Amino acid sequence: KCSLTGKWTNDLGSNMTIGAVNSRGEFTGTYTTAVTATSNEIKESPLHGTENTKRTQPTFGFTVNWKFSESTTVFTGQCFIDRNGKEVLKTMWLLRSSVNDIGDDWKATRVGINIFTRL
Amino acid sequence: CSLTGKWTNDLGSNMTIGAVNSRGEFTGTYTTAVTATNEIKESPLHGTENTINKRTQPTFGFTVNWKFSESTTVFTGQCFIDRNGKEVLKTMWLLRSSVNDIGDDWKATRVGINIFTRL
Amino acid sequence: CSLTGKWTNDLGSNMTIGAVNSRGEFTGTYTTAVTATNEIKESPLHGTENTINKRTQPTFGFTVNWKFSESTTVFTGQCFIDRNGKEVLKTMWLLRSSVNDIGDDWKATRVGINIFTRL
Amino acid sequence: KCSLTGKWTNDLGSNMTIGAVNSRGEFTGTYTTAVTATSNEIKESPLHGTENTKRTQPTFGFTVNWKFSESTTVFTGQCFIDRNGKEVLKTMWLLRSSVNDIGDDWKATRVGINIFTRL
């Protein structure tokens, strides 16, 4: 029992809202980040993702298409039943900044973790 | 530069992305040539291209849901136009493996790079 | 804040760094509590703290050479001073596995996070 | 036969010079980067690392303590005999930028690849 639908808050402070997961595992939702590496308005954004499909703790993966910037973030993790019986999503992401030349690409990728809980 | 078409990366793996809808969203299929070794196979991958500020070289992020075995991959990158007037997808990914328990999570994620071109 | 002392991270693993020489360099031992599963064990790790601009919270980078099995790890992070006036090592790492051939390289690196404190 | 000593050039354009590797696998050298994510003088710097120790293609790991900035980079990879009989070092690195608060840590880590050859 680890539905992906719902509202979740992360260690960095953000909030993530996911909808009803279908049969092929997909889903959609909004993701208000609580942190920014830019100078723009922290404006909400939609995230698209899929979750494997029969174990209780399935690994998923989604893309959050930010609205206030030319960037994308990709999280990938697994739904765990944190010992007592509370769900906990541990994930990792790659923050893709945008450049102008096919040269300054390396300085474009950032990596970090993120633990989500049911806010 | 658009993620519509048949793409092959540097590992020998192909991938086709059908039409990138109004909003951003897009679908396709992925045929890898490697693995952590069951059988190779296609799987469905869905993504999203970042429109905002109507570029020609935007960042994108798609999730490949490996059917065989409980994996996922996520690719994050930018649609380029390398100086040969051709196209080039420069991206890094994260391969999440399904792990037995919450406390064996530290070892589930793998990081690497891939570069898709056209065929 | 200095990398001198006995440190334990969030995985149950300890680590001790002897004296950080004039230049930067420093040595120590690492005792993990996990693995990709031979036996657990200590191994020697050497690092380097970045002096330039004489800070108190500088970045560092040390390489743990896993003797048992042909691995490596590398940790990159910053010596912090979290608001409890205590210390905190916030770092991410890369675990490289020895692979049979050049063309099976894409799957050798793993990415994750660790946070060492004091004892 | 894959000695680590010597001068190597990387895909990004940089040059790396490594010295004599000892018995415990360690080594030292300079590393002139050919790219910078800052506004400083691209000034040379020393890198410290170790290499496992009996296979022909051993995996290593080193830290490059940059001189023109409060930062550290950590590479980790493996020495491969590129088919014909030329050595080739494939590696990955984590570029650790420095922050001021134990909060803005996530925006601090960058990841990317790097292939070295005997310039």
Swiss-Prot record, chains A, D:
Compartmental location: Secreted
Homology family: Belongs to the avidin/streptavidin family.
GO molecular function: biotin binding
Binding, biotin: Y31
Domain Avidin-like per the UniProt entry, residue ranges: 1-119
Task performed by this protein: The biological function of avidin is not known. Forms a strong non-covalent specific complex with biotin (one molecule of biotin per subunit of avidin).
Secreted in keyword set: yes
Gene Ontology BP annotations: antibacterial humoral response
Glycosylation sites: N15
Protein name: Avidin
Alphabetical UniProt keywords: Biotin, Disulfide bond, Glycoprotein, Secreted, Signal
GO cellular component, one term: extracellular region
Tissue: Synthesized in hen oviduct and concentrated in egg white (where it represents 0.05% of the total protein).
Domain of life: Eukaryota
Subunit-level organization: Homotetramer.
Disulphide bonds in the chain: C2-C79
Gene: AVD
Post-translational modification (record): N-linked glycan at Asn-15 consists of GlcNAc(beta1-2)Man(alpha1-3)[GlcNAc(beta1-4)][Man(alpha1-?)Man(alpha1-6)] Man(beta1-4)GlcNAc(beta1-4)GlcNAc.
UniProtKB/Swiss-Prot annotation, chains B, C:
GO biological process terms, semicolon-separated: antibacterial humoral response
A GO term, aspect molecular function: biotin binding
Gene label: AVD
Binding, biotin: Y30
Keywords assigned by UniProt, alphabetized: Biotin, Disulfide bond, Glycoprotein, Secreted, Signal
Protein name in the entry: Avidin
Tissue-specific expression: Synthesized in hen oviduct and concentrated in egg white (where it represents 0.05% of the total protein).
Residues of the full protein shown: 28 to 147 of 152
Organism expressing this protein natively: Gallus gallus (Chicken)
Disulfide bonds: C1-C79
